[PDB]
Design a protein around this nucleic acid. Structure first.
Lengths: 174, 49, 60, 170
DNA sequence: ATCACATATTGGA
DNA sequence: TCCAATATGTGATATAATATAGAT
DNA sequence: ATCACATATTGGAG
DNA sequence: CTCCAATATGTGATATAATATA
């Protein structure tokens, strides 16, 4: 709270010290709950769903059921993702072919942060720095991964040229 | 004939100018990441210039 | 000649590759051509022409 | 239909509905639950009585849970092989379809009975609606309209077998 | 980009 | 206070044969 | 920068 | 001329991070 005064403050984005402590408490509870969930020999998909729900529930239990911490976490991830929309429009246009959208990335990153990052949080450490680093690095990874198949979206438009790509591609070899 | 290269450069520099809260060096590298030897020739032919 | 993916006649690149002697390129019956053909009030015969030549596989 | 909510530093909802109508930003599920009264609120008889009557007559067709997708032979998809990498040629419509599927999956993997954050679910429904609208619009604007459209090209006209093209001489 | 059609404001009356 | 004019914005839509081809 | 699972290749006998 | 067992090798899926602000 003392360091937050200097920088420009956005009320939705700011993380109070109490919220950091709530996340740390949830981290301890998550770490002690992980082995029990791992020992359960049930199917792995239902187990991942259960892990996600249980970790959400430990955060809610430390939050007195207010769900405010989860709202602020979603807002953090949403801001980090949507900041790259205007700047990195090319990679988003390409990723549209791969059925990957900004909100899809936000939801997947939310699941990953709650499941595979919050347990890794260090004691008496700032959550916001770790979260910023991991989210920005995951966005870099997403934009810079070599996908197995290159994608060609046939543009069925004739605004300028006489024949569009789908037209000729149909008539030639199909 | 050189206009497609200018369009590519303008896209990259618009990306870097509009970049927010990220490593500037990284985006500057992305400017020249996919520049390939056959880019100009392929763009010249396919664009029917 | 070769039928399109939609089961309708379409041009092939065989004449370009010198696999065929003449073009074998299908003619299009335009909308204006349909209007002019409609002078004969036998729409059944026109539909039979279009179906057997293009639209219907069984009739062909 | 779009859902938007703001939060405080502590996390309490702080929008306070100062400049927005009470009916706006409720969500698509709230819209379906409150569709009749909202329809009565916003319909103007003078200009839209016929449209409101058409909606009354077809109340069943207004909301649907299943989306059709047409044959893949109409949606060109080629799995071409390249030296540097394989390539997939598809019409844009396919993308949209795929998008929808992905969304519904991410909505169905989470238990619908368990209460979840609205910010995670309702904007997904709104984006799904946008994608479906774009699917319909693209089907009309590409496959079914104009000289390129199946209506003018092949429904009235057609490429004709047993045809010839000749020069004329006296 | 030409033609149509429809809103949104605004200077004007 | 209202309104018609201006302005912005929305929307349909387009010939005729034809050369191809985005870290470890 | 691993790792669990799938596959062509060697070892072996019948 | 099959069938067995096992080995070394390939391929998909996953994993890495700790200076905050429409």
């Amino acid at each position: 709270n003392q360091a937050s005064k200097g920088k420009k403050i956005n009320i939705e984005l700011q993380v109070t010290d109490n919220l950091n402590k709530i996340y740390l408490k949830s981290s301890v509870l998550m770490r002690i709950l992980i082995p029990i969930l791992c020992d359960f020999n049930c199917d792995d998909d239902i187990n991942e769903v259960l892990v996600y729900d249980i970790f959400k529930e430990v955060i809610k239990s430390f939050d007195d059921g207010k769900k405010n911490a989860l709202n602020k976490l979603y807002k953090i991830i949403y801001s980090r993702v949507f900041e790259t929309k205007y700047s990195d429009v090319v990679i988003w246009t390409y990723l549209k072919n791969m059925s990957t959208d900004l909100m899809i990335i936000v939801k997947d990153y939310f699941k990953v942060i709650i499941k595979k990052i919050f347990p890794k949080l260090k004691h008496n450490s700032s959550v916001i720095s770790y979260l910023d680093v991991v989210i920005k690095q995951k966005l870099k990874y997403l934009f810079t991964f070599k996908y197995p198949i290159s994608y060609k979206p046939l543009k069925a438009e004739t605004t300028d040229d006489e024949e569009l790509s789908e037209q000729e591609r149909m008539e030639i070899n199909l | 004939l050189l206009h497609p290269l200018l369009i590519k450069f303008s896209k990259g520099t618009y990306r870097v100018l509009n970049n927010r809260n990220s490593n500037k060096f990284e985006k500057i590298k992305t400017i020249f990441s996919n520049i390939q030897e056959g880019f100009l020739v392929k763009k010249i032919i396919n664009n029917e210039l | 000649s070769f039928m399109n993916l939609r089961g309708l006649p379409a041009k092939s690149k065989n004449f370009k590759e010198h696999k065929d002697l003449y073009s074998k390129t299908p003619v299009r019956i335009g909308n204006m051509e349909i209007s002019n053909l409609s002078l004969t009030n036998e729409m059944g015969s026109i539909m039979d022409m279009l179906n057997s030549y293009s639209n219907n596989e069984t009739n062909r | 239909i779009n859902y938007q909510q703001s939060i405080d530093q502590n996390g309490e909802n702080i929008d306070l509905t100062e400049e927005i109508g009470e009916d706006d930003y409720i969500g698509l599920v709230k819209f379906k639950d409150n569709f009749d009264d909202l329809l009565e609120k916003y319909t103007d008889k003078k200009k839209y009585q016929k449209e409101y009557d058409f909606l009354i007559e077809n109340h069943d067709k207004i909301f649907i849970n299943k989306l059709p997708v047409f044959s893949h032979k109409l949606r060109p998809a080629t799995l071409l092989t390249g030296s540097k990498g394989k390539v997939l040629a598809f019409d844009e419509i396919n993308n949209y379809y795929n998008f929808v599927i992905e969304y519904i999956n991410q909505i169905n993997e989470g238990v619908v009975s368990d209460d979840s954050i609205d910010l995670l679910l309702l904007p997904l429904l709104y984006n799904m609606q946008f994608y479906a609208n774009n699917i319909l619009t693209r089907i009309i604007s590409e496959y079914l309209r104009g000289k390129k459209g199946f209506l003018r090209k092949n429904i009235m006209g057609s490429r004709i077998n047993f045809s010839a093209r000749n020069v004329i001489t006296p």
